[PDB]
Amino acid sequence: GYDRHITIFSPEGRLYQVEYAFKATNQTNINSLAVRGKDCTVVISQKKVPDKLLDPTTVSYIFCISRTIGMVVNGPIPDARNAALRAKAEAAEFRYKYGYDMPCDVLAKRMANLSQIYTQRAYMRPLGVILTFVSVDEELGPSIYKTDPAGYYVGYKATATGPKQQEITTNLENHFKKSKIDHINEESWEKVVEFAITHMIDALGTEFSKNDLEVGVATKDKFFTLSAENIEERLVAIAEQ
Amino acid sequence: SDPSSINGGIVVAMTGKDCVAIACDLRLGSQSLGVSNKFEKIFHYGHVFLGITGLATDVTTLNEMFRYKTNLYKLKEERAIEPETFTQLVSSSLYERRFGPYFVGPVVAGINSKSGKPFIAGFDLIGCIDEAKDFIVSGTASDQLFGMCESLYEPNLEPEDLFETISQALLNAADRDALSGWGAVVYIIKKDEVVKRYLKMRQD
Amino acid sequence: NNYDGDTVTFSPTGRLFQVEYALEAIKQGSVTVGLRSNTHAVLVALKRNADELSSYQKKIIKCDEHMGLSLAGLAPDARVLSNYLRQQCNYSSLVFNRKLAVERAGHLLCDKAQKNTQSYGGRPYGVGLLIIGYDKSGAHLLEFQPSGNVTELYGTAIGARSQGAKTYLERTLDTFIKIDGNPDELIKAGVEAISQSLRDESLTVDNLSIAIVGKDTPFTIYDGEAVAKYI
């Protein structure tokens, strides 16, 4: 059964290598979440540093692709960084060729096309990663677009990825059923980050210290990550309410 | 050693009432030496007529090239190419050789079989389309042809009248050019009949 | 077993079987010995014939005026690698007016062998080499394995029954290292070393091959009647 080793069709029309790449996604045992505010797009992800010998500042699955675009990865770090470097190069080339900043959704499509090629061409394996791109697009506003090893991509009102993704997904679904809107109706990004953490706490059922989390925020004209103290400040605000 | 004036020759096209005319001389020379008095410069692919002046080897080559391309067009499209479409094909093909061009002055003439509209067009050696309501000129006596056409031409001429006008435009222009003449051919083109006439002209 | 079809495959215990099989070709090869003092470096090699009508396969190759090696295993692979060393030694001379350090020679061979163990289609080199030389830091002896591993030593031996000579040199270490300014004695120690690897056969005049390089001695090879002195 060599149809399970390379990306050719099985008798039932499936691509097992693509399916097994999806299972590599959860190898890190980390859950990520993305939501949109009025002015911003917040992405949060768990940060697990098991080894005491690790430099915790270098352990990250969130990447600054361009000044405006951020990307969080669910999957092994080697493939994650492979995707990040390509995304950065693609975004830079786009700006040079076409004279304006690459939109979040266009970068997502491009990376998805690259992933599709690996599902059709035999010599290239799929990357065992799911890429969540976030920005505040100058045309489309707050944006979340997600890519997988099948080459599939789509925009999101909000999203979650990881082993316990389904719990987070339904938690968010139930909130948007209640609020009746496509986003978090909040002025400041600080409170949208607080919302993101609050709802992750409820869905996962765990408490977080300042070092258990990782936060990326996209606003108009810049995407940035938060420091441990920025998150701690945010955790204190949730606790005092 | 100016490629466009080694062999000599002229082509002119005109529109009339529900008809078009395209005409050319018959000379092929090598500078001063007249070599052939049978060298026709007008060709046709289906109902679309193409005249080509300039370097004679490129005239022959481009004829063979457009016959090639229009034959494949017809096989794949299952219909004859129209003048407007053929005009675009000529422009594309010439610009493809932008920095090593065919030294030619082609002229498209024909009637669109769907709309019935008369159509003429001219090109420079590198593809620039020159569309006209009235007339297109080309060749070593183009100045002369411009002067003849601009004065002799009037709109909506009948096929028989248009024949006289275009013939007199060509003949008198050719007689003021050393490299043009040695015989002439005129094509009168109606919606579904084409008449070809050889003109008597001075042979010097 | 299932992991020895090519060099690009690791076994479940992390082994490269094609590289190990290449290593096996060296073990079948005729014994050759290398040793040095502080002034000279010596190669001794037992040559092998097809039968009594044939010649004896040459084991020693000169690379430069100050460097050369002996071989054990696939001879054509030794020709390829020695030719590469000749070029590298030569490049160093023409471009930098510099005699190639014996250590760099080892690093270059290592990196050339390594590339043949990580790519599809290729195969490992099937030969082991003992490189001797005299450069700006004195005498040297290197051992090349086609796994890529190159090792600098006072003395060593490779080939069939090389363990006998290798044990002897390990005992004789303190003696032969201080044979300075005396070529014939350093060779004698090498000839006695290779004698610990002989079985049923003894060293004859068209059987023994010796090479030497040192402070005031270019790399030169001795065969035929020139080695009769040492039997």
């Binding site: 059709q120 035999a122 010599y123 679904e173 | 769907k114 | 599809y120």
Partner: protein
């Protein structure tokens, strides 16, 4: 390194079958239903928007795509394969036709170029066939309206009406009863919505259905005025609201 797969991954079996093509067709069978109906004055193509999650914005994912102003495409099978085929199809319409003739290719020839791309994925080295069947609807001056199906093999057939994917067998039978050669475009849209309801299970509205037409020229969608011969695209995607209007008089 380098692509060492220079050999065919699709080969003939002893029985004469081309396995990978068959298996690609199997992937198309699993895919969501899409259909196309040809009327006298237009063509309609339609499909269900199977949402992956309710948090996903299904508007951002377009199953029906414009190839030229007068040609549109829809599919059944693998979405990613379709997306790259649309990219390639749009480009080849320019490179191998518009940049040569100064006009857009007729439907049959664009289809022919897409078919060629899919055939090559069936024979070239180190690639699998595309896991999609396309339905391409279009118009051109000399051939009028037309509808084509393109399979993973690269074969294409012209249709009066057809369906592909999940419930294609039932949908084709439904279309045989309803189709005549006198159908007006609005009648074809009506039949398209009826046929699609059979295969759709959950919600059936303008947000879960994607539908486009090839009909009259749309000068309002051109974006400029001043050239009489340029009259606008015949391809138009029906809005969510426009679908719901027709679902009341269903």
């Amino acid at each position: 390194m380098t692509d060492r797969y220079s050999f065919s991954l699709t080969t003939f079996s002893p029985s004469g079958k081309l396995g990978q093509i068959d298996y690609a067709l199997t992937a198309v069978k699993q895919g969501v239903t899409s259909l196309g109906i040809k009327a006298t004055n237009g063509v309609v193509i339609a499909t269900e928007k199977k949402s992956s999650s309710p948090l996903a914005m299904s508007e951002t994912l377009s199953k029906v795509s414009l190839l030229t102003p007068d040609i549109g495409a829809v599919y059944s099978g693998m979405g990613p394969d379709y997306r790259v085929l649309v990219d390639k199809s749009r480009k080849v319409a320019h490179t191998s036709y518009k940049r040569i003739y100064g006009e857009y290719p007729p439907t049959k020839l664009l289809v022919s170029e897409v078919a060629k791309i899919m055939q090559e994925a069936t024979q070239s080295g180190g690639v699998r066939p595309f896991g999609v069947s396309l339905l391409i609807a279009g118009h051109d001056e000399f051939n009028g309206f037309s509808l084509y199906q393109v399979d993973p093999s690269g074969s294409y057939f012209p249709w009066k009406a057809t369906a592909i994917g999940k419930g294609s067998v039932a949908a084709k039978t439904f279309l045989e009863k309803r189709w005549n050669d006198e159908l007006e475009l609005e009648d074809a849209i009506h039949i398209a919505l009826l046929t699609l309801k059979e295969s759709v299970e959950g919600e059936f509205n303008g947000d879960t259905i994607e539908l486009a037409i090839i009909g009259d020229e749309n000068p309002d969608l051109l974006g400029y005025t001043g050239i009489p011969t340029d009259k606008g695209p015949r391809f138009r995607k029906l809005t969510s609201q426009e679908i719901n209007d027709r679902l009341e008089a269903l």
